[PDB]
Ligand SMILES: CC(=O)N[C@@H]1[C@@H](O[C@@H]2OC(C(=O)O)=C[C@H](O)[C@H]2O)[C@@H](OS(=O)(=O)O)[C@@H](COS(=O)(=O)O)O[C@H]1O
């Protein structure tokens with residue numbers, strides 16, 4: 001065993017190296033992680049920024065924001081990995097040969113690799129969230145499946161007014177989302193209206209979604225729907241438990257959320273709510289547009305080796321372990337004999353994952369054992385196919401075949417100087433967007449009177465300078 005310090009968090013939770021997956025990795029690698037993030041920290045961004053101030057860097061630095069990792073590397077806080085990989089990491093070396101896009105994702109603008117991304121299995125599943133509705137409530141109310149945003153409005157109003165859960169109470173929550181910050185609330189609300197709260201691509205050009213006319217229209221409509229009780233009153237204040245809470249209590253009528261986990265509730269709730277059918281639909285059309293911008297990026301965050309690590313060779317071998325057949329299987333599937341067994345040589349999940357007795361989704365079970373824990377690993381779509389229901393599996397194909405998903409932006413890279421300029425604009429604009437969007441949706445103020453002042457407000461923070469940086473990076 002080697003004590004190896006790490007800064008690692010994901011989904012609000014510091015890595016516990018005694019989770020089943022990491023106990024197995026420790027046994028296979030002789031690397032014993034010790035986390036410098038503590039079990040009480042939940043805000044990964046603030047924990048990371050604080051961690052940079054605390055003297056020596058941990059041996060391994062994992063982080064959800066890859067530009068900050070490349071900046072740390074340009075400053076000399078993380079070391080270049082590409083020669084270590086060449087000499088000592090045959091699995092990563094092979095992976096970079098077989099995957100040009102992923103290799104390009106790992107190279108900073110100065111030509112060094114400062115981090116190994118945590119890659120989605122992007123070329124096998126790139127769809128992410130999809131639109132779902134209570135087909136059993138549609139049938140109960142004799143309603144057609146809505147296809148346009150206007151039809152969705154009519155349906156959600158019916159869900160609010162007509163007691164589809166049959167209890168004589170006006171408790172229905174027609175539309176809800178699942179989010180742990182305001183940006184992610186907006187993400188699952190404004191895409192209905194073909195708007196975006198982030199930067200996106202239009203024909204090779206990068207634009208800022210909150211400055212676009214579609215966003216104004218999205219906020220105006222959401223304001224109306226919120227006043228009429230069509231949108232969850234508590235939309236900005238629930239955490240990630242919203243979906244479990246609203247579905248298991250038979251309150252939620254419709255959502256926009258990840259396809260496999262959201263599809264898991266039909267089987268999960270089949271006994272507590274007879275006939276529960278939360279069904280995938282294609283994105284609703286608005287003025288001829290049937291597209292969704294919900295898509296995976298090629299990766300999310302990454303991890304690197306700091307200049308303070310006394311044995312960087314043994315750490316790149318640790319990084320490489322996760323790209324071996326057994327390491328990548330462990331990271332994705334959990335523990336052989338517990339989460340899965342090998343059937344005809346390939347993992348098949350057990351009832352512990354597929355039919356959890358407390359009603360956890362399969363993914364929530366896997367996260368409990370330390371699987372899918374974002375670091376610098378390569379997700380295997382065979383794991384997602386392993387637990388996805390038949391209707392989730394058909395639904396990836398339904399979204400792909402109908403061509404409704406717009407590809408996400410590549411993760412953009414910067415020099416350290418351009419990153420510093422961009423974030424001082426981008427983070428300030430973010431705060432304005434989130435302040436005004438909540439204010440407008442919650443019904444204070446008036447977007448029509450206020451829009452032009454808001455746009456000017458973004459411009460005065462440097463909107464056009466950030467637009468220039470984003471287009472140079474793309
Ligand atoms: C790389 C990573 O961990 N991504 C998180 C998402 O995990 C995906 O979730 C699902 C699914 O829900 O069907 C399928 C993919 O295999 C997973 O990589 C997801 O995590 S979570 O388990 O739902 O919490 C999102 C959730 O955050 S959100 O509701 O705010 O989008 O977080 C991504 O980190």
Ligand SMILES: [Ca+2]
Nearest residue numbers: 163167169171
């Ligand atoms: Ca009711």
